């Protein structure tokens, strides 16, 4: 995927596909920040090409922005464009901001002069700073060469102070000529004016891609207030259509869905292919417009994924394209654990590789949310059957989180859903799995990943906790099938396996045109030993949600200390279910047993 | 297979599989040397575990031996064991011999005292001294073997002291014992127990010499003072003059001896070929140890793997030297790092110069004209290629060997391309997950699945080339590279980077991908490909119709490679070219 | 360019830019041509240039003399210096020019010096001209009362380490077209065709458009072999195993040759500007023997 | 220039690509009116035009092709049948089209005219044999029909032109069923826009078109007023076109019936007509 926004815009203009971005701003509460990170991560699944983060005046604001960029690039896996102004900005401040964004893994900056502070009417340049945004574009270009792609502001309805169309487009030519790759415009509601303006920009020999600022409608108040503040031309037809239901913001949102989307359709018709949405840290207004454009992912046009796992865009992780299967559902975790790696694995895991894998606590690979909340989610299990139930509920999308998954139940699971439900009801508590795939088109809605016109493959994988009573019988049965390889381990330390070497076993791979074989998912011993400690720790952190001496707490602590964790690979990828069949009929003893405290 | 012979012998003794080796000697004529290299390369297909090369006393013998080792390891791809004596041998001479073998890639030496042309130039007295010398010099790099004598030494006939000296040589750090030829089997298997009785545990390797003539049999046997059974004598007596009857008798005589050695648990057989295939071959067939369709020769990789100096780890190559193995080795020989596991994007490989590396046509011009005749027009060339495809002729400029069986799938499609003037130099059919034991497509570990993208590479007239390019671009699954001798390069590639065209999924293992296609490599190949066609032209006289035709052709024709990234449908590639034909196939050039 | 009066060349009035400074050479190479190009180069034209080794024209005078002129370069900076000396009229010959530095260069003299001092060794160039009077003392050619035009051209050797960055920068400008090539063979380009691109043309009264200078792929491929050969013949002036000899032979085997046309003739120096900031690594490095 | 290549580049760029089918009128007057109308419609910017071939009409068609190619500057595709056509008639027709500069070709019982052809597959093969690859050739129980389509295509046709339809779902289904049979050539839908309520229903019923009840219901109230019917049937047909276009089929072939306005209104509705904003491009002054 292109890292420079100019390239993304260009290939968007070429393919004609749905291309869009989300602008967010730094909130004041650290709470609002967490909510925003969650909202960002949900909106990620809409599938933007990039996001923006705005840059205020204020010391906290400047630091928060830089921290938010790191978060977005490394963990949320969202290609970010950090805004940067000359408002209260010494050159030392600018070089700091830029160095932070650099080390985040960011490759996109929006070079602005900036609105004045909340103290200030007039924009005064901070001493040893820049006068114009043209000066900052040239500054970035000189400092970091062509590492950062630079975007700049544009004004189809004129600047707030400046209403000379001709000289404004001249200074736009200046800012662009200093080495900007693209223009992002202010919000507008007069479309004809915009598409006129676009020709007048091109008339002046300004060739760069233009990106319209779309602000969708959320409330009638916020719509009119922001629009009037920025002095937007709103059509009387828009006014007249919103007038009757002005109080009802449900009716206004379902109206302003189609008003804004009609404007977008005419922008899109005109050949302009990218839409930049001002979310205001809100999903729904944007989401409704994206649905109105059928740009949200469907069965018909499913969401494109680079790899079978959520790829990091952290500093130096651009080349990372192979991981163990074990953090399939704990992406952020793997990132946390591997963050201090000098070299990321690339193309193959390889035999000599001895990985490090971090420390659990000191990296924040723990529980999400309060204990009070997690008890609300999971209740108070007294016996092993209650845990089974909880897993079955997750599998049926009834609850959304379990300790061993960052997210709700996958669609890849929804193939083998009832097989895994059956395993859980028998006490084989399944943490992780994947079905076998024998050469599905790389655009498959469920199995697809990577470049177009490929073929993808997977070996069947299954990973579960089992009672030490039952474990022997499972081991026996697994060894009695030649295609199966396993690794089994206890919290205690003990490790059993029938593996023929230490070296990694490929479990997901793809053949693509013009390219070497992609092999993004492996299984490997050292990695599994890193994973098992996390896996037991998560179940123990779950126990710690409950009061000391609880039936819940004792149950879970017991479970973790005494149960095995078994992974199984079916090296036959022609027939995947062999592994679900081999386990049929086995059940754990004392599913209903409560461990007594008297 | 493990580089050290002791490990091979041990796992042979364990599995019980067919394990055997071939001993050869340095000939005096450089011709006999070339014949031997050819014979070696044929016998390679029998599938030995290793070969031996004997060491004579003389100076040029010492140099020839070292040259032969390099040849065998790097180019013929045969794990060699170099013999080394203390006959006429200064320590400087020994250290030189060892350094040569080292740099060959060799990991196996047979440490001998040596027959005379026995203290020479104050070297070593006994072979025990040389075993210890090698061990001290090169540590555990060389696995060392030593001689053994089940019927006694010629001069030395005290069996008890002999086994004591054997214990000495072994205790200096030998990994295995290779015996002299014998024909008394009972004596041998008795001897084996007497060796073990003396606390000599190493693997024993019997010296088997099969029968080729009645004369050479009896002469060598009497010279070594072999006990020949009266039953052997009596069976060979009536047809003694007829060496065809003697060879088909002594096939079964020797093989019966081998069967009793094999029964006894001794699993490796070392054949004294005397630089002759047939005598050994008949015994190996008698033991059904020679490969069949039913039990084919296993291939590690889709191409002949080198055992050269830094080439044990080499497991990825361009497709373009599929049929010029020795050449690729010659060109890449000065590489400090060989590619392993993947080719990778960063790799900028510096291939060797054509002339500087002896990457040319085989045999005399007089001979090559005999093979290929005198082409006057493009149709004659077409005919020659069709003849190769039908196994009627055995060599073309662009192939070290005769036509593949992998070709016999798409045989008629390639014939049709050639008859239309699209002269095909290289190809492979698409394979969609053949079991790794497929008799044709199989390679690599057992219970795998192998895959291939269809590949096609051919010369085409510059008149027709435009139409071909157009057609190829009109197919999304096809990628090509086209180039002229002149320099010009066209392509529809999305990248510089390598494209995988052969790959394998194995259990417990990362994906194997031994064959790729890549731009820089293709540019190295194109120069070779035009040069070979030009060297072909140089076979003919200066002003010739043949010469002018070929030189013209090479200077002015394109070379097109095409990958079909669809491996579900392979013939797509042959179909999309159907109906195109080069303009004046029968035209003879007037020389003006 | 210097017009030939050879047997069938009275009508020859279009040539590639590449032998702008090697006239005699172009004549030698094209001597066996049945038809000399006239009025336009044309798309169909498949030109068969002469073989270097077959002989023609190469380096001038003795090795002893050429070493006297050019000295003994040990590193890439010494070569840079020599080119800067040529540009400042201090030395009179370099391998890639039959003659001393042009006056047309003396417009863009400082720009080309700056490219050389950065290790981008410039073998050929021309500034953009937007309708100079056909009597201009520097740019003038052809009939009186005309107007002449030129697209900016630039051609230089660059280290294979730096070449990627150059390619990136060139592709990031829409008005630029390039062709890049290695001695090895490899050819990169962003051209939309094989066909010739006009880089010098003139409007005259009572006359059809004159277009004497073009840029074209097949011709560039003929030229690149000459260009590397000249640098190699320079290396052969020195003793085998020399620091000079090894330096030059290395350079030629491993460096790219990039030509660039700026199809904007309204803004000419844009070509010299877009390459600002690039520099070759190890300018002072001596290759150890 | 070969229509198959034009259709392919159209499918690639996704731009506006469309053609106009005309028929030979009986009056020489109607012919002059048509040449004028052709020349006006030229400015809409079609990629090519078609001229239909009756029994005759044969002579007029050939004259009209010359006119269109040489003077009006419009790339023409001449239709050619096997109806009342000896092989000498066919070779004549083809030689005329050849000399025009054309590079594109498409009783009670149908009785094959003696020493001519039975099927169109035979004529496709005939053209291919006679004129090599000079002419690009187009062609017109669902299972056996698509078998014969495979035959006609396999004889060396570059593209398929369909009959008029008003059932869109049926069409896009059919397209997949064609491709299912290994018939890969570019498809060109037959679009016939609406000019009058009478001509619409009459021609549609004659060809036995499925007309949607929604189309019927929308045209019912203003059936007498053909101004209202034309501004309605503008958007009816154009909606059908939009769904064909969305599906990746990028060329639209309009049955003009020698009339500009019906087609023109649909092309405007698709903003496929040139504007000031996107003017008609000129190769030369
Ligand atoms: C998508 C987007 C996001 C933004 N995000 C932020 C943000 O996060 N934080 C923030 O502070 N600001 C942000 N802004 C910008 C900000 O609110 C103001 O609009 C800004 O002060 C002016 O725009 P500029 O930064 O492009 O200025 P510049 O173009 O560098 O300079 C602005 C000044 O130059 C003047 N000018 C015009 N022509 C000439 C000329 N020929 N010569 C000299 N000067 C001339 C203008 O009239 C104006 O007074 C954003 C703008 C956009 C479009
Ligand atoms: C497989 C094989 C390959 C051969 N290849 C070659 C070849 O390539 N070139 C060649 O010239 N010859 C070759 N020969 C012949 C062999 O090298 C000679 O027969 C050799 O001299 C025998 O000695 P040895 O190598 O076994 O070593 P040693 O056993 O060290 O030879 C020493 C001899 O002296 C006696 N002896 C006396 N005192 C001692 C003592 N203290 N310790 C040890 N031995 C003592 C031994 O009984 C023995 O006869 C080969 C023989 C075999 C079996
Ligand atoms: C786009 C288009 C253009 C038209 N152009 C003309 C024109 O120029 N002139 C004209 O007079 N009319 C034209 N018509 C109408 C019509 O084609 C004629 O009236 C007349 O009926 C000619 O043949 P056809 O319609 O049967 O078509 P065709 O498709 O040409 O019918 C013959 C083909 O149908 C198949 N076929 C039919 N019956 C059989 C069978 N029994 N066995 C095997 N295969 C069979 C074969 O593949 C054969 O090649 C056109 C219609 C359309 C939709």
Residue numbers in the entry:
A (entry chain C): -1 to 596
B (entry chain D): -1 to 115, 122 to 596
C (entry chain A): 307 to 595
D (entry chain B): 1 to 56, 59 to 108, 118 to 151, 162 to 306
Publication passage describing the model:
Methylenetetrahydrofolate reductase (MTHFR) is a pivotal flavoprotein connecting the folate and methionine methyl cycles, catalyzing the conversion of methylenetetrahydrofolate to methyltetrahydrofolate. The eukaryotic form of MTHFR is homodimeric, where each monomer consists of the N-terminal catalytic domain connected by a linker to the C-terminal regulatory domain. Here, we report crystal structures of Chaetomium thermophilum MTHFR (cMTHFR) in both active (R) and inhibited (T) states.
As such, a mutant (cMTHFRE21Q, L393M, V516F) was used instead, along with reductive methylation of surface-exposed lysine residues to aid in crystallization. The construct was successfully crystallized, and its structure was solved to 3.4 Å in the active R-state. Although electron density consistent with AdoHcy was found in the regulatory domain, it was weak and could not be faithfully modeled. Even so, the homodimer assembly was found to display the same dimer interface mediated by the regulatory domain, a β-sheet sandwich consistent with the one previously observed for AdoHcy-bound hMTHFR (R-state)7. The catalytic domains were also found to face “away” from the dimer interface and each other and are not interacting with one another, in stark contrast to the direct role they play in dimerization in bacterial MTHFRs. In this active R-state, the si-face of FAD is unoccluded in the active site and forms an extended hydrogen-bonding network between N5 of FAD centered on conserved residues His81 and Asp50 (His127 and Asp92 in hMTHFR), along with a strong hydrogen bond between the universally conserved Thr52 (Thr94 in hMTHFR) and O4 of FAD.
